[PDB]
Design a protein around this nucleic acid. Structure first.
Ligand SMILES: [Mg+2]
Ligand SMILES: [Mg+2]
Ligand SMILES: [Mg+2]
Ligand SMILES: [Mg+2]
Ligand SMILES: [Mg+2]
Ligand SMILES: [Mg+2]
Ligand SMILES: [Mg+2]
Ligand SMILES: [Mg+2]
Ligand SMILES: [Mg+2]
Ligand SMILES: [Mg+2]
Ligand SMILES: [Mg+2]
Ligand SMILES: [Mg+2]
Ligand SMILES: [Mg+2]
Ligand SMILES: [Mg+2]
Ligand SMILES: [Mg+2]
Ligand SMILES: [Mg+2]
Ligand SMILES: [Mg+2]
Ligand SMILES: [Mg+2]
Ligand SMILES: [Mg+2]
Ligand SMILES: [Mg+2]
Ligand SMILES: [Mg+2]
Ligand SMILES: [Mg+2]
Ligand SMILES: [Mg+2]
Ligand SMILES: [Mg+2]
Ligand SMILES: [Mg+2]
Ligand SMILES: [Mg+2]
Ligand SMILES: [Mg+2]
Ligand SMILES: [Mg+2]
Ligand SMILES: [Mg+2]
Ligand SMILES: [Mg+2]
Ligand SMILES: [Mg+2]
Ligand SMILES: [Mg+2]
Ligand SMILES: [Mg+2]
Ligand SMILES: [Mg+2]
Ligand SMILES: [Mg+2]
Ligand SMILES: [Mg+2]
Ligand SMILES: [Mg+2]
Ligand SMILES: [Mg+2]
Ligand SMILES: [Mg+2]
Ligand SMILES: [Mg+2]
Ligand SMILES: [Mg+2]
Ligand SMILES: [Mg+2]
Ligand SMILES: [Mg+2]
Ligand SMILES: [Mg+2]
Ligand SMILES: [Mg+2]
Ligand SMILES: [Mg+2]
Ligand SMILES: [Mg+2]
Ligand SMILES: [Mg+2]
Ligand SMILES: [Mg+2]
Ligand SMILES: [Mg+2]
Ligand SMILES: [Mg+2]
Ligand SMILES: [Mg+2]
Ligand SMILES: [Mg+2]
Ligand SMILES: [Mg+2]
Ligand SMILES: [Mg+2]
Ligand SMILES: [Mg+2]
Ligand SMILES: [Mg+2]
Ligand SMILES: [Mg+2]
Ligand SMILES: [Mg+2]
Ligand SMILES: [Mg+2]
Ligand SMILES: [Mg+2]
Ligand SMILES: [Mg+2]
Ligand SMILES: [Mg+2]
Ligand SMILES: [Mg+2]
Ligand SMILES: [Mg+2]
Ligand SMILES: [Mg+2]
Ligand SMILES: [Mg+2]
Ligand SMILES: [Mg+2]
Ligand SMILES: [Mg+2]
Ligand SMILES: [Mg+2]
Ligand SMILES: [Mg+2]
Ligand SMILES: [Mg+2]
Ligand SMILES: [Mg+2]
Ligand SMILES: [Mg+2]
Ligand SMILES: [Mg+2]
Ligand SMILES: [Mg+2]
Ligand SMILES: [Mg+2]
Ligand SMILES: [Mg+2]
Ligand SMILES: [Mg+2]
Ligand SMILES: [Mg+2]
Ligand SMILES: [Mg+2]
Ligand SMILES: [Mg+2]
Ligand SMILES: [Mg+2]
Ligand SMILES: [Mg+2]
Ligand SMILES: [Mg+2]
Ligand SMILES: [Mg+2]
Ligand SMILES: [Mg+2]
Ligand SMILES: [Mg+2]
Lengths: 127, 205, 260
RNA sequence: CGCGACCUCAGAUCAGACGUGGCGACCCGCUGAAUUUAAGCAUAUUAGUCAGCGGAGGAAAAGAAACUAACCAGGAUUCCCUCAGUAACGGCGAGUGAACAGGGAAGAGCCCAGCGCCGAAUCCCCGCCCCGCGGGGCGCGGGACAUGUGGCGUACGGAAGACCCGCUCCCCGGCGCCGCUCGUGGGGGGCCCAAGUCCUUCUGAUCGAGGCCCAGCCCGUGGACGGUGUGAGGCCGGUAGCGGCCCCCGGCGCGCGCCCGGGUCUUCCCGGAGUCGGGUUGCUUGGGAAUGCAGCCCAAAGCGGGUGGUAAACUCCAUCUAAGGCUAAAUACCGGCACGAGACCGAUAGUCAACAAGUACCGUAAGGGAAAGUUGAAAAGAACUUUGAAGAGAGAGUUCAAGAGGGCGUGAAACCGUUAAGAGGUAAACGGGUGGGGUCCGCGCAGUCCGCCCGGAGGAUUCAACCCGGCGGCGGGUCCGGCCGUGUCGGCGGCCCGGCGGAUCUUUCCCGCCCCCGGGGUCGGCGGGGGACCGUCCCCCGGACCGGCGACCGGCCGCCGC
RNA sequence: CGGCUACCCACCCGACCCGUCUUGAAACACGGACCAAGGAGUCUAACACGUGCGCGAGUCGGGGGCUCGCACGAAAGCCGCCGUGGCGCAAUGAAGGUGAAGGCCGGCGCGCUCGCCGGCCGAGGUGGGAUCCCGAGGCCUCUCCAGUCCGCCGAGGGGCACCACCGGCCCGUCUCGCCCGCCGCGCCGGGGAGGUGGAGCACGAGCGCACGUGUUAGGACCCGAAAGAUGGUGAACUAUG
RNA sequence: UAUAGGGGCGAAAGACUAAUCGAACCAUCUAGUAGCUGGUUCCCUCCGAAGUUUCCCUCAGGAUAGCUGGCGCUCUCGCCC
RNA sequence: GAGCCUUGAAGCCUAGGGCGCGGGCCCGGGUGGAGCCGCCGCAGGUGCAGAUCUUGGUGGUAGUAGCAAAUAUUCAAACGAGAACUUUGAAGGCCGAAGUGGAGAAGGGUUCCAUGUGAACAGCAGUUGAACAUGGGUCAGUCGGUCCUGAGAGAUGGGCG
RNA sequence: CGACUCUUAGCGGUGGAUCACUCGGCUCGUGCGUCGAUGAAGAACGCAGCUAGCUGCGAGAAUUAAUGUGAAUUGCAGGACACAUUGAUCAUCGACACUUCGAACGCACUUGCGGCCCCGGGUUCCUCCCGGGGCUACGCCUGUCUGAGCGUCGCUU
């Protein structure tokens, strides 16, 4: 139950801050869960997604055994796009399909020095 | 406009009272503000007690409320001089000083002096340097408390004289009748006219 | 409202220009100029009886009636039929009002609290609250209240040692104190007989805080228990007692209908 | 005639510094109506308000009595409840309308002009040095202010000067650092638990049942939001004196700078002026023989002046010391910056404005002032063929759905078109009564009713009839074996190893005191403490009643499934 | 086969188009082309009455305070040497002021159109008055005997609520009369008997809460004016230099 | 360019003063007041009037009484009077 | 109420079935796609036929009145799907120097010019325009403002408030 | 037989009522106390690759520098794809910058007309000569400089 009086249980204010949040807040909102082997190996529950993360889709029209790599992350639309998931238009031109990043299981992460610092902070705060 | 049998009313609502409406919607707000003010005072100020300066035993000027007692304002400089301490030294001790309050009653004088002696007995002070004037060792483990509540020595002290047992007595019961009040009233109403008639009797030889 | 719909300045036409006698906003170009002004029957108009901030909202109750309602609610929480007719599941539950030990109030982990409710068979009453956690009916979903969560048991205690932590996120449960008895929590919705779970110190402090009909309450200064209107109130026992049936006329069960 | 000093002055684009204007919800100062009421209207009420004008601050104003009272006297200002719709004002009509107590919130007091004493021991500016990081402030040398009066000591509560007594020796402003603090000081960034497990539908699922005898898992975290719909676990976030870093503010502790109060006696000083008050006149007030303010005139006193609610004279008493000034507190805030909540509204409602709203537009101008939300989960916004110059259409295609195709959710009424049925000279329409036609509903139409008992015909089963074995309840008696309920005495036993109340007591008890002759006297008086007695609860055995919703066990008659 | 029916049609009879102002509407009286949405007795304060609840000669915390920092908590619980205070328990007067108990028995002063002492009872009497109590008497298959039993009642008594009257007490005026007391003998106080006016007493029923009706002030059931005041904007039309 | 609202200007019509002039326009007081027109929103059941006395600067209005409704209370009968 | 449901809630339509005298309600069939209801108490901005009611939409009138102030058009060709209206040749007329002409002050602000489209506006129409979209166009010592005073408006000194 | 008119039902067309949602209002309360001569509020003009409005900015103009976070903004081409160099975007912003009018300040405001000082080139110099920078409003306070007085006085011709 909410106890701090400096945060809202208010639907209008939460939807306002959600649909008008800046991009550094939208990066924290667009976060994806991890696979069971990667969370067993790293001891971390959730991570933000980036351009070169490999993605297995768990829900939607396409489900499972589709370990592909994302290409674009529209934070304005709250939608990542996956190279494996395609759909043809009327004129035979392919186009990516809108997938929300909360229905996304990450199987591989991109390694970077900043991501090692992030993973160290995750493991230290999880303790 | 009026009607059947009812009381004649003169409501004072002809003036534009709609603009000036003050309704206590912030009454629990002021309650929480003043709780926080009292608690922040007890935190920040001192181990001085709440309602810091001590108030005197004071009678209320009326024919109505003079049977009761009251916590006054200050200790009435003649009383403080009989108690024998300096004015601002008393203000730093905790004595409330009001220079306006006079003294007509020796009884109230001695009552406030004994109240000051009791306060001086209950006083425990702590200076900064350990040269120890008016102190000593750890007096009652820093006096067992930090802050008193609602007056230090219970400033009401409604004294209760009883006089429960006495035997029926001599002709006071035959002399203190209703006629004494009427005779005193007539004497007070005709005091000066008898003096004028005595002056005229001395004038007319 | 507090700010009028009289922001639009307007005048009425009168006899000529026979549209109406209602005031009309005056101007040109804008097609609002000539429409309905302030008034109740007009578009964009000030409402009839604008709700004011000086309405008599809050209602004072006598303290004797407050304590009377607390005593009546606590008395109605003892009978099994009243609480079963209110709807708590008291099938596998042991004896009425439950008195738990003083080791209950020192709980910190709520797994022990869930285990205690399962062993005391209040888990059915919690499971009813689990089964009914539906969505709010109507337009009340906009003002941040979107859950119909029914009330379950309440645990009344003193000397808090973590019992609010152990009983804080159970659905349907109610935090309640001995020295602060709430009518709105002991009988929500004005319906008496809520299932309650007491502690040893609570169940002994009730007799200290209200008393019997012999002595007064020792914590409350000027309170006594109410006068009992009908002492032995079994109406079937009274009407079937021999003292009443000694002085009855006769059982008259003839009908004497209409004779054609 | 000239030079010099003071005083009244001017000048500058001299050096340095200051005011203008905005906002104006709250606050201060001025002045300022009428609509309305009085059923008419002048006094009155609306109102010392709307409007107008001048100012500042987060509060403002007020604020240390020229006070209230009239008795066993209180004692700065402000805010609330009462006083009180009272005293009182009013064509005493309508109406208007306080204050002192008293209970609470908060409570902090002071300074200067005069009187005098200190050789102006006082302040501003200029120039160089002592000086420290993020910067200006003590001290050195000469130019001014000021004797027509700086500062120190002083303030009506008395103060000062000189002896006597006895002690005290002292604080406010800097600077480096250690551990904290009641939310665990302020703000910001970033991080913190637990299913996405098999079946099932669905376009999508967050739907639906279950996860071993330990309840699949977490909870100090089941608030809320988005996510293809209804989630505590899938994601920000939610609980936690949960955990880490950076920035700022406070009180501890080395240098520099200043530093005599109290009691007795003697002497001396002791106050605010066109101000009070009086006459007269306007506004205001509840203030009336004038509450306050202001204009004009007359205009003080020093055992004085003011107040003491009825004008005046005489007399007595109480209280205060006006014509100089400062100060946080409780109080107000429809302006502003950020924040949270709602028994409120839900696109004709709610602010005029959910949207490129004070926008489009109108008037020369002051000013007036709108209409207007919704495709779908995703644009995947209909490729391609074909008629037409195109608008548009017929196929095909996407989507769960074009019956969602660009103001595109749902799609009613008024109105119109077409189809189907019926009718048509007294305009149409209606009520009562039927008849005809049509849509539709239920039923099987010369065959549809059921539940029980008994006399008949075959099969298949085992109780029941009686008892043994067994558990659970109903009912009363010995109230037997023990608990508990109501009143009665008793041990006064927990009265000192008890709870509460008593303007019922004990001056042979104690302490702090007063009186009369260091001691004595209950000789008398006050407060506090100990206990004597009264009015309800805690034990016990003995008795009475009910065994009463307070029930355990044994036995008895009669139920009960296996 | 049956079916009432917001379907259609025909036939017999009756049938003027609703709302209001009005004695009178179908009116040659007024509003109404049609349809969808909005639209008119609310709220505050005060009073009165009725009702329900709690306490009840008391009642009420609305003003503050106490709890640890809790979403619901702007809730709720408590104060009691916080009852200050509002209303009620006492009224009458303009006011100084005064202020609601009488009755019975015995004794005395000439039981005198007259006061005192001792004891007792205690809010008076009359006529009604729900109810209640006592009870002559009567009645249950054959005789004396009986207890509760079936079982009413002439008459009698005590008399709630209230009604009608009389009498009594308190206060202010009016009339007539005598006495008592001295912290001081006076243009000092008090008392007696009658007739009066009062919103009085004559065993008190109020306080708080909530609902309903009615009235009043507030915009106040909704809409409506000719008018007045305050402050600003216009001589680009027109009038005159 | 000057005269700006009880003001201006007027060879004078009370004519003109931004389509408005026997007192302009805009906003505020203001939702001014009206004894005066119009309207006033679901059903059923029960009871059910008056246009009259008196008074008022009263005659289109109001107060009082009457007529009416609601809420009750006190009793009476069910068992030769 | 272990209420209802994406195996379809609210809303709407309905020659369907029914209940209650009535306010209204329940079920059947169809569009629709995400919230709704029964009982007990509580609180209302709670029920429409009218108010020359306010807002919005739509009929009869009605394909009706009306597209008639200023003498008037006609043939052929061309661009064009399409010509009574666009352009050119030719014929006939009007304005007739107080113009239906050539340029300005005020006022308009891109309307000026070229190209392309013709849904939209031009009261019929368009291939046309002052419509729409795109791209261009205003060059000063000697033209005017700037300088000067005119009627007048105005600040300091001063006075009033 | 048809045409026209009326009443129901289906479907279609104008219409946007009802229902569902709300990045919106309204109320209440808490926290803070903040504008400007060092140029406030407000207004005009300008700024994006394609850019009318709103929004955001001021010739450094869709933002500059710095801190924090950490791989993008996006409708489209381009551009830095670097991250064992310096790092895109976003928020904070404490450092720089802030056209003109505006209390508006050299005058009134017609973007006009000046007056001083300094710096660069123009006859290498003022003499009403081009560009750039600084100053130039009123009132008033303290101090400095100058001089007006038959206001008062001293010494002297
Ligand atoms: Mg909100
Ligand atoms: Mg009436
Ligand atoms: Mg008014
Ligand atoms: Mg208003
Ligand atoms: Mg207005
Ligand atoms: Mg509105
Ligand atoms: Mg609804
Ligand atoms: Mg100002
Ligand atoms: Mg009138
Ligand atoms: Mg009038
Ligand atoms: Mg007045
Ligand atoms: Mg004003
Ligand atoms: Mg300020
Ligand atoms: Mg002051
Ligand atoms: Mg003083
Ligand atoms: Mg009163
Ligand atoms: Mg007067
Ligand atoms: Mg009156
Ligand atoms: Mg007044
Ligand atoms: Mg959700
Ligand atoms: Mg959720
Ligand atoms: Mg998580
Ligand atoms: Mg004096
Ligand atoms: Mg005098
Ligand atoms: Mg005097
Ligand atoms: Mg006197
Ligand atoms: Mg007097
Ligand atoms: Mg003063
Ligand atoms: Mg203050
Ligand atoms: Mg809508
Ligand atoms: Mg609108
Ligand atoms: Mg969408
Ligand atoms: Mg569908
Ligand atoms: Mg649609
Ligand atoms: Mg649809
Ligand atoms: Mg036909
Ligand atoms: Mg009539
Ligand atoms: Mg007539
Ligand atoms: Mg009619
Ligand atoms: Mg007519
Ligand atoms: Mg009509
Ligand atoms: Mg009509
Ligand atoms: Mg409606
Ligand atoms: Mg009552
Ligand atoms: Mg009292
Ligand atoms: Mg007038
Ligand atoms: Mg004026
Ligand atoms: Mg002109
Ligand atoms: Mg003329
Ligand atoms: Mg004339
Ligand atoms: Mg004339
Ligand atoms: Mg005109
Ligand atoms: Mg006129
Ligand atoms: Mg006028
Ligand atoms: Mg009105
Ligand atoms: Mg009006
Ligand atoms: Mg009459
Ligand atoms: Mg009439
Ligand atoms: Mg009447
Ligand atoms: Mg009656
Ligand atoms: Mg009746
Ligand atoms: Mg939807
Ligand atoms: Mg219903
Ligand atoms: Mg309404
Ligand atoms: Mg509502
Ligand atoms: Mg209607
Ligand atoms: Mg009607
Ligand atoms: Mg109409
Ligand atoms: Mg209309
Ligand atoms: Mg519309
Ligand atoms: Mg039409
Ligand atoms: Mg025609
Ligand atoms: Mg023409
Ligand atoms: Mg051709
Ligand atoms: Mg051709
Ligand atoms: Mg032609
Ligand atoms: Mg031609
Ligand atoms: Mg010409
Ligand atoms: Mg052109
Ligand atoms: Mg056309
Ligand atoms: Mg063309
Ligand atoms: Mg154009
Ligand atoms: Mg040239
Ligand atoms: Mg020229
Ligand atoms: Mg002037
Ligand atoms: Mg001047
Ligand atoms: Mg940068
Ligand atoms: Mg320059």
């Amino acid at each position: 139950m909410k106890f701090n009086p400096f945060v809202t249980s208010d639907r209008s204010k939460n939807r306002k801050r959600h649909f008008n949040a800046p991009s550094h807040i939208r990066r924290k909102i667009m976060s994806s869960p991890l696979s069971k082997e990667l969370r067993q190996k790293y001891n971390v529950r959730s991570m933000p997604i980036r351009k070169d993360d490999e993605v297995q889709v768990v829900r939607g029209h396409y489900k499972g055994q589709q370990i592909g790599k994302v290409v674009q992350v529209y934070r304005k639309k709250y939608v990542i796009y996956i190279e494996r998931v395609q759909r043809e238009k009327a004129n035979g031109t392919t186009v990516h399909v809108g997938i929300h990043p909360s229905k996304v299981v990450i199987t591989r992460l991109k390694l970077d020095k900043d991501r090692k610092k992030i993973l160290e902070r995750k493991a230290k705060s999880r303790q | 406009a009026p009607s059947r049998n009812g009381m004649v009313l003169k409501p004072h609502f002809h003036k534009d009272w709609q603009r000036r409406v003050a309704t206590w919607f912030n009454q629990p707000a002021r309650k929480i503000r003043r709780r926080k003010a009292r608690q922040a005072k007890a935190r920040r100020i001192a181990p001085r007690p709440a309602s810091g300066p001590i108030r005197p035993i004071v009678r209320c000027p009326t024919v109505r409320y003079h049977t009761k007692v009251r916590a006054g304002r200050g200790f009435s400089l003649e009383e403080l001089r009989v108690a024998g301490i300096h004015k601002k030294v008393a203000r730093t001790i905790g004595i409330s000083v009001d220079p306006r309050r006079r003294n007509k009653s020796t009884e109230s004088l001695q009552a406030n002096v004994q109240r000051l002696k009791e306060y001086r007995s209950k006083l425990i002070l702590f200076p900064r340097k350990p040269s120890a004037p008016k102190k000593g060792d750890s007096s009652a483990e820093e006096l067992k408390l930090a802050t008193q509540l609602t007056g230090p020595v219970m400033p009401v002290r409604n004294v209760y004289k009883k006089e429960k047992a006495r035997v029926i007595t001599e002709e006071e019961k035959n002399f203190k009748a209703f006629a004494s009040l009427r005779m005193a009233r007539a004497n007070a109403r005709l005091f000066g006219i008898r003096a004028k008639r005595a002056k005229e009797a001395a004038e007319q030889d | 409202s507090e700010l009028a719909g009289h922001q639009t300045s307007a005048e009425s036409w009168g006899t000529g220009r026979a549209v109406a006698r209602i005031p009309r906003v005056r101007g040109g170009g804008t097609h609002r100029s000539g429409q309905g002004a302030f008034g109740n029957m007009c578009r964009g108009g000030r409402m009839f009886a604008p709700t004011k901030t000086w309405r008599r909202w809050h209602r004072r109750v006598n303290t004797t009636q407050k304590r009377y309602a607390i005593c009546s609610a606590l008395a109605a929480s003892a009978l099994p039929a009243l609480v079963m007719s209110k709807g708590h599941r008291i099938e596998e539950v042991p004896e009425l009002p439950l008195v738990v030990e003083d080791k209950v109030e020192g709980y910190k982990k709520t797994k022990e609290a869930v285990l205690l409710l399962k062993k005391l068979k209040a888990w059915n009453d919690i499971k009813k609250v689990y089964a009914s956690q539906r969505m709010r009916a109507g337009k009340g979903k906009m003002r941040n209240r979107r859950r119909i969560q029914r009330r379950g048991p309440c645990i009344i205690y003193n000397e808090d040692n973590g019992i609010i932590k152990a009983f804080r996120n159970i659905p349907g449960i109610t935090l309640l104190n001995v020295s602060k008895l709430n009518i709105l929590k002991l009988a929500p919705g004005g319906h008496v007989g809520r299932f309650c779970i007491w502690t040893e110190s609570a169940f002994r402090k009730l007799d200290e805080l209200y008393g019997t009909w012999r002595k007064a309450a020792s914590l409350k200064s000027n309170y006594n228990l109410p006068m009992h209107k009908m002492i032995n109130t079994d109406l079937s026992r009274i009407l079937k007692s021999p003292e009443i049936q000694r002085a009855l006329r006769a059982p008259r069960k003839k009908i004497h209908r209409r004779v054609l």
